[PDB]
Amino acid sequence: AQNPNCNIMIFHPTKEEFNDFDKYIAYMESQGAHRAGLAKIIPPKEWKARETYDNISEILIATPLQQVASGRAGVFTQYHKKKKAMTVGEYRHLANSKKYQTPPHQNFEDLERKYWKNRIYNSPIYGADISGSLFDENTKQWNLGHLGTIQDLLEKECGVVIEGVNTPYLYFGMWKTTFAWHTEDMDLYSINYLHLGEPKTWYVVPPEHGQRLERLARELFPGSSRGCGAFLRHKVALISPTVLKENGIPFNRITQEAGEFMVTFPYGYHAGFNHGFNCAEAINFATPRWIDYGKMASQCSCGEARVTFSMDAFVRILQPERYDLWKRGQD
Ligand SMILES: O=C(O)CNC(=O)C(=O)O
Ligand SMILES: [Mg+2]
Ligand code: NI
Ligand SMILES: [Zn+2]
């Protein structure tokens, strides 16, 4: 068995290997990359996502989200308070202000220490989940707006034609902006490209151990657990590496820098934080190996998780027994 300790693997494809996206994912999996839940892909030196980032300031963040924490430093939830719209140039200035800027630090490990010590005492503002793309239309390789769609994959594997679309999302971050512990909708893959700016630190639980994280989360968030049998689908809970180590939960960590891709694999729980002003692009995707994960994915039916139009078909076809209850949660 390849990668039996579930380490995060880092890949350096050549320009020739970068042509066929599906083939390269399948290659990475042949080497055991999925066992970690997360892999890093460094593009060939010849590749670029677009020519420059000099003209992005007029992009609108219609609903910036202030991430307010509750709990203790290593075990907290966050809620998202909606703020007034602002442009990317306005948000960059805000991120660089004395109130929000990254503190002085020695290295990524010192910054990580400062994040876990201090996160809860601040409320950073995240421009998340903005439909759109920063890939140039002429970028042919690993262009996250030109991937094969999940609807087409389901149709190729299972023969059923379904409605829905699959488009990318932009994330504009600042110091301390945080992504809570989650798997993707329907336990899909994700791919995330850090277009510019400061790094993003990731934490990940191997898919084979995801239920260990769930059981810890039910213990640490006991009211939330009573409210919903899949409350990590709400995407609000944070657990620090120190707490995970104290409770014996297997995990790994890695820092993504600008110009790098990360791939999350089906049922790989992940969480993380931004180091400073940055912009990432991410999208979900599927492969043949996902289908079994999709059929087994948990679902939130309490009403909190509320998701895209396109998840309807996935539930309806892969999980017909759950469909009625889940759809009630959506309505
Ligand atoms: O970058 C972020 O805030 C969160 N991204 C992801 O969870 C991802 O790409 O799957
Ligand atoms: Mg612009
Ligand atoms: Ni994710
Ligand atoms: Zn729920």
Swiss-Prot record:
Keywords: ADP-ribosylation, Chromatin regulator, Dioxygenase, Iron, Metal-binding, Nucleus, Oxidoreductase, Transcription, Transcription regulation, Ubl conjugation, Zinc
Domain JmjN: 8-50
Cofactor-binding details, from the entry: Binds 1 Fe(2+) ion per subunit.
UniProt entry tagged with the keyword Lyase: no
Cofactor: Fe(2+)
Binding residues annotated for 2-oxoglutarate, in chain numbering: 126, 192, 200, 235
Compartment(s) where it occurs, according to its Swiss-Prot or TrEMBL record: Nucleus
A GO biological-process term: regulation of gene expression
Catalysed reactions listed for this entry: N(6),N(6),N(6)-trimethyl-L-lysyl(9)-[histone H3] + 2 2-oxoglutarate + 2 O2 = N(6)-methyl-L-lysyl(9)-[histone H3] + 2 formaldehyde + 2 succinate + 2 CO2
GO CC terms, sorted: blood microparticle; chromatin; nucleoplasm; nucleus; pericentric heterochromatin; site of double-strand break
Binding annotation for Fe cation: 182, 184, 270
Protein name: Lysine-specific demethylase 4D
Organism from which the protein derives: Homo sapiens
Residues of the whole record sequence present: 11 to 341 of 523
